[PDB]
Amino acid sequence: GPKGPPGDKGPPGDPGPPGARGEPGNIGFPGPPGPKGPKGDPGDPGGY
């Protein structure tokens, strides 16, 4: 007898998932030194 018509193209494939989240950034550099300290006290007056 006569062959039947061909079947439908199949359903579409599954969508891919999102990529992984990037790695979090590195810890920041340590800060610089504190400010230089204040100037010393003035000397005593000279003696007599």
């Binding site: 891919g16 340590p30 800060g31 010393g40 003035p42 007056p45």
Partner: protein, 48 residues
């Protein structure tokens, strides 16, 4: 009559989206203490 041929395979699924960016890194540690201040100015003459 004979059965029709099976249909062809479906279209592929789309690739997934790129992942999110990582989180920003941790803030750096504090720096060290600052350097010592300069020496003070001399005192005045005795009897000033």
């Amino acid at each position: 009559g004979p059965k029709g041929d099976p249909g062809p395979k479906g279209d592929p699924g789309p690739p997934g989206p790129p992942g999110a960016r990582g989180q920003a890194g941790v803030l750096g540690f504090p720096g060290p203490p600052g350097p010592k201040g300069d020496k003070g100015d001399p005192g005045p003459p005795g009897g000033y």
